[PDB]
């Protein structure tokens, strides 16, 4: 009984619960992640370039 009593209240919370979120929140979440993916790719490349530039500095010095 008492689990179901609290869970019926839980259900009444789940009912209430997103129009604000519907686009913008997930739009921002996605676009933020796309930003993080873009900078993550750039950081991969930037690291690679730094590896090569330090290897050439050793090979020259």
């Amino acid at each position: 009984l008492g689990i179901v009593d609290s869970y019926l209240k839980h259900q009444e919370i789940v009912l209430d619960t997103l129009p604000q979120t519907v686009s913008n929140q997930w739009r921002i979440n996605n676009d933020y992640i796309r930003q993080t993916c873009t900078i993550v790719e750039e950081m991969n490349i930037q690291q690679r370039k730094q590896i090569n530039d330090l290897e050439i500095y050793r090979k020259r010095l």
Binding site: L8, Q11, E12, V14, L15, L18, V22, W26, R27, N29, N30, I33, R34, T36, C37, V40, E41, M43, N44, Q47, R48, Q50, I51, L54, E55, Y57, R58, L61
Partner: protein, 53 residues
């Protein structure tokens, strides 16, 4: 009541199933790239000591 909530949820799930697989595919790309990045850091901070040596 549980199905009534599920009808609400569905109304959102149809909307958000546009955005949710992008967020998943993006987060999978993060997990792939951050491994690639940590390996890049490791080799950078080994060749910096061998430059000093």
């Amino acid at each position: 009541r549980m199905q009534h909530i599920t009808q609400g949820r569905t109304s959102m799930k149809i909307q958000f199933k546009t955005a949710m697989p992008p967020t998943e595919v993006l987060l999978e790309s993060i997990q792939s790239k951050v491994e690639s990045i940590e390996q890049l850091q490791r080799k950078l901070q080994h060749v910096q000591p061998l430059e000093q040596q």
